[model samples]
Target: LPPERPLTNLQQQIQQLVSRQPNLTAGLYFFNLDSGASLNVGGDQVFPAASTIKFPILVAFFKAVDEGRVTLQERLTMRPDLIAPEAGTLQYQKPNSQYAALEVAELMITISDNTATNMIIDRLGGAAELNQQFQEWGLENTVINNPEPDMKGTNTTSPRDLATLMLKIGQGEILSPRSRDRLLDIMRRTVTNTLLPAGLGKGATIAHKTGDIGIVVGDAGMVDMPNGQRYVAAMMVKRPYNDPRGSELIRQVSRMVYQAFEKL
Candidate 1:
């Protein structure tokens, strides 16, 4: 509707899909990297960050690396106290086991490993450190109070902030090329592909993260279409249950956004 650049119908498309659904509420942010044109619905609205907040956590870790505060080579021991209860492989391991801090960082993104997330937060000194870094980086709606496995909603971010963060990564605003690539590389290997990548064209590559905690399901990342156009997108949905319908809505929105950019 906007001459193949952006769309006028996307907002309507979003409204139509969500309005009919009884218990589903969603936010979406889509940005064209080349043109700086963006389309969003409820992009400024805050939502339970879930694991999506890990994207910022990953950034904060890398910032520390870049500033010489911590070297990626340092090894951290896995104590039972550091393990979060759900969504990670580290919990199964014995206490006193050791792992490279960087390896745990990779797990934090690639597997949405909750235990790894908690460990990373601890290594960074606490949630306050990351939150401060996030604010300085201009993620206004993003915050962290508790560590991982935080199903009570202590961490929060908006669709706009999530998308903007990915865009900044794409633009090389903060992390160096090597560090940026490292962060995106881990995200590219994310085990959860059901949200954004599930709707994209074959051969399109996505570097992203997924957050699921029943009530809120989200995925945010930078997408490179097969046609060579790249974009950053973030989607979150709130539902009465951990319903398949919410995930379906996110997938559908992903496809709609993909089709809009696929032609460009």
Candidate 2:
């Protein structure tokens, strides 16, 4: 069982953010390699996973590659119709275009490429498969419009589930060890950070994913453990989307969480 989290300490630490931006919601889990030190408060309530959903999409795609259902090195044509509007640069191609599966996967995750995600989603057998795999992992709350024919960026999940997914990927359970680390590597190479991972200290090697919409913002990822003290932190915000107060809030909250781990 998880211990009772330091409510007083965390509340005091996060006061800096809530003092300025009180509308933030977060779900967090921090544990040592051999101990269960978890903190959960609204970790299950769903909010859009945004581009973070692409991590699952990537896992599903590459696992299919290993299973012989898709070829990683093979080319897949990209047309304008398959692209999600305003989400990525791939759609900027004038007359519609194409790239290999591996290239698409790279763009989809590293840049959170919207067009690349759309194409990969179609190839991975849709969002339903994505959710089904989530279920197989005993995660029922994290859901997507995977059966498709639905709006993009509509998938939703709690911080705990997304954080758990990060932990699994870190464990190389999402794919082969090499594939898992590859996914982590690409996520770290992200073109955007200004969110959760933005707060951690330098040299902390965090493998992370971020999601955003006009009113919603989020980031979830695992910190590489030198002490094998892997932890997942996810915070989501609604309403103050344009201000970036959400990102700053999570950063302050993260500093507190790190301190909480130390108080043990």
Candidate 3:
């Protein structure tokens, strides 16, 4: 067996905070973009991915664009079969409405649009194909077992897997330069700010995605600190369905993480 390393002060504090909540399971991973410092608390534990699965799907979309398989300006029809219920405004539009590919992509991230995601997944060749690509990218715990609005929570991912992907994106190891910037910009515009963004200090910005399905809530993203430092963060908490404590736990953890990094 590999040696068991001692927990960092930040990890210990996070663990304590998590311990305070009864019947809750939490996983988190953070990687410093500049210094390479990191912390993992149950980082590898798998949890229901919820809408967070769209993050990788968005990456795959950009990669396809870079490969010339798709174009941002191309129009994709919102077929009735492609529409998914809940979590998006696109579903309410007429069945035959047409939207630019890039606009649909933006909808997937910024609004967590479920139908937009289903359309993107179909355009990219479906969940199984994307799952293969995710494996190729070395994501051990991220998988799409089902399509959008997976209320049963079959799709799964781990905090470390998400942080690793974010780290790669931050380092320019994934999408092309222009595509990377475009992707990050889309993420920065995400409309949901009640999760990780709620805990950030003033002037800091996080390009992130949030996932919620009553039983599990999570947020993952790259944070650009006000002081010029940056880090990748992924966190998930499993609680009783729709429990308010789940979201509060994430806020507290995010605040602690931001403060810890600021002092480093």
Per lDDT, the best of the predicted structures is 3
TM-score comparison, 1 vs 2, better candidate? 1
lDDT of 2 by residue, 1-264 (tens): 344343554545454445565666555444433445555555667777767667777778878887888887877767666766645678787546778898899888787787888788878877777779888865657777642223344677777777777767666675887677677778888877777665665456677777777566677887754444667776666645455666666676677666555555
* Of 1 and 2, the candidate ranking higher by lDDT: 1
> What value of lDDT does candidate 2 attain over all alpha carbons?
0.68
- TM-score list, all predictions: 0.95, 0.85, 0.96
Clashes (N, CA, C under 3 Å) per candidate: 0, 3, 0
TM-score, prediction 2: 0.85
The lDDT for every candidate, in the order shown, is 0.87, 0.68, 0.90
lDDT of 1 by residue, 1-264 (tens): 122244567777877887788888888888887755577788889999999999999998898899888789898878777888888888899987888889999998888888888888888889887888889889998998787789887789999899989988888989999899999888888889999998898899999999998989999999998888888899999986589999999889889888877765
Q: Which residue pairs come into collision in candidate 2?
A: 127-146, 128-146, 128-147
Count steric clashes of candidate 2: 3
Which residues of candidate 1, in runs, are more than 4 Å off? 1-6
Q: Candidate order by TM-score, highest to lowest?
A: 3, 1, 2
Give me the candidate number with maximum TM-score: 3
